[PDB]
Symmetry: C2
Subunit: 388 residues, 2 copies
């Protein structure tokens, strides 16, 4: 009997199966939700090895007829977003946009966004849902600023993410409708009469005065979607940790300069990644004790690696004072997250404002009664109800 993948939408503890997989068969043949077979890689050493070995290809996971962990929901070129951004002279604009340093006002602006959202929740009084009342609008605001578009339509745009990042056994009429829906939105913002001036779109506008609208809007849409969903989901998991372990919040209030280390450890700990990092083998590769064949699917289990005791002592305990923390929460090798610094900044600023404004933050009900979203690329609570 082949073990099933994915593992468990419960995101507040490591799935027992992840620990058993890493200890017993750190390169394991599993059945994905499509019915296809894959190798699931669950130890830190083998995970890191896959990500740093370019005979394991991310681009080719989107090719027709290769085994899949779930149905493609975007055009196969978009999975190669970073390849297309490089070959079209788009890297500079993208890289500059993904720099917390190129937006000298960004930090103070995110801080004000965080505080405005929390002041509203404080006005109404507890309980409140920190997903709809905080992480969702906060992440949407950030990526609206990244693109240079207003935040007016953030509810609609985050609703597009609710469809775009669905994990489905088979493709489903709508992923494409949903894609072209928000592609059209991005094309319109880019071709507006007072041509857009700030953000990614502004750089795009100048760029084509010296690449198609479709490609430009594709890069804007996929950056918005991937970034808003990944930051919002990570922040929710970080909040759950702070609510469940109030001594961590006491540490952050007493020693604000530790926010960088803290978020780095929360990143190691966090289970927001609800699928694995996929690669197609371009060649036969011996990995651990398994001979992987050219053309087979490889799945890197980030939470397997980030909780591996060979690398992280007491991996199951959050620890803001680890000597070393070489976690894989942002991936590694060629496709290491190009927005890691922004992801860190986004979460550091939100949690700093959170522990200051809601010092008695706690969950409104037992953590085991949170509703964890099914069938989605991210693990997240549908609602995050808290008291303070």
């Amino acid at each position: 009997p082949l073990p099933d993948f994915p593992l468990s939408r419960r995101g507040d503890i490591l799935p027992a199966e992840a620990e058993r997989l890493r200890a017993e068969q750190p390169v394991a043949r599993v059945r994905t939700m499509t019915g296809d077979e894959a190798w699931l890689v669950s130890s830190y050493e083998l995970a890191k090895q896959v990500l740093e070995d370019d005979r394991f290809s991310l681009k080719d996971t989107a090719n027709p007829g290769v085994p899949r962990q779930y149905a493609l929901t975007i055009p196969p070129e978009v999975v190669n977003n970073m390849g297309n951004i490089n070959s079209a002279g788009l890297r500079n604009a993208v890289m500059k946009t993904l720099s917390p340093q190129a937006d000298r006002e960004l930090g103070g602006w995110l801080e004000a966004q965080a505080h405005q959202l929390l002041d509203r929740l404080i006005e109404q009084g507890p309980p409140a849902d920190l997903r709809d009342g905080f992480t969702e609008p906060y992440s949407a605001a950030l990526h609206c600023r990244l693109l240079g578009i207003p935040t007016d339509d953030w509810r609609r745009l985050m609703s597009g993410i609710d469809v775009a990042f669905i994990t489905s056994p088979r493709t489903f009429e709508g992923s494409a409708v949903n894609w072209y829906k928000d592609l059209g939105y991005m094309v319109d913002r880019l071709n507006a009469d007072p041509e857009p001036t700030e953000g990614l779109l502004g750089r795009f506008a100048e760029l084509r005065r010296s690449v198609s609208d479709e490609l430009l809007a594709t890069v804007a849409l996929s950056l918005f979607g991937a970034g808003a969903v990944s930051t919002s989901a990570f922040l929710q998991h970080a909040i759950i940790a702070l609510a469940q372990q109030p001594e961590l919040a006491d540490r952050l209030r007493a020693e604000p300069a530790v926010i960088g280390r803290a978020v780095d450890e929360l990143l190691r700990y966090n289970l927001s990644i609800g699928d694995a990092l996929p690669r197609i083998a371009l060649a036969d590769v011996r990995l651990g004790e398994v001979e992987i064949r050219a053309g087979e699917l490889v799945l890197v289990l980030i939470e397997g690696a980030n909780y591996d005791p060979a690398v992280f002592p007491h991996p199951e305990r959050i620890d803001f004072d680890r000597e070393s923390n070489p976690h894989l929460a942002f991936g590694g090798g060629q496709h290491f997250c190009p927005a890691s610094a922004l992801g860190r900044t986004h979460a550091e600023i939100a949690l700093t404002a959170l522990v200051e404004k809601l010092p008695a933050l706690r969950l409104a009900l037992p953590v085991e009664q949170l509703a964890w979203r099914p069938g989605f690329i991210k693990r997240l609570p549908e609602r995050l109800p808290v008291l303070w």
Copy 2:
């Protein structure tokens, strides 16, 4: 081994267990989520008997120390809402508020609300989530109008419902904080300096010039919460039915006057009641083959009764042309829903607008991949993504 209750969260087909219980043990001892035991009553004849026999008591289900299907989340007096309303001389004001005929404008206004919400979704284009974009704002609008309060804070109020109607094994801190939070909101509206003149709070403000502020606000909050959550959840189920069975939408387009019968049948079919109707036996009672003892919990499984083939031929098939339809979707006996006519009007007007405005309505992905909300009094999809 005792069968577990509740049955299943998936709301688009009758749980197979409901048909098995009804056929083999229509009065069945079950283990509720609290660990308490109860008698689950799942055939039509015995369901209706329980509802019409007043030695099965609703008010006493809230008593300290009685067996429970889930933790009390409101003050125990509120389970006796209608009792308190009748004894405090509030019945006339309440029933006048719940009468669609007493609000001669209500029909045209509900139609216009439904159209504005659908036009907004047409503006943006498919896909859309008809829960957040349609059934939630529409139901909150109606119940804001019922109370005489603005709709400004409807997301906050609907979010209070997300906590109030949770089913928990044990009491949780959020329930009481949540309750008094929105009790105070209602008190604030009732005691505004421009004293309220419209709706239930207008009728209340007059009444106390001729019962405390707390009781008045309690009735307002319980009616908002119960009515909004119940109409929103039913309407979501009816939409699924029209999306899954477009011949039904074709029928409503071709013959709009059948909307009343259609909604009557959708009510029989609908699985929005996600728990059972609770009663405590006040005396020993022989129900079917089972001797029920004084003090024991009795649970009326509405969908068991409404799908009973002894009463409803081909119960699994929606049918707008049934000779008879004496369904229990509003309950029966002394606690029959006092707002049945309003619930029907609410759904009729929304669904008439829906099949006119979205003639090609269909689900955006397969029905089996809808996310059904866990741990809630209602069965409902977390998102209702559709195309048109």
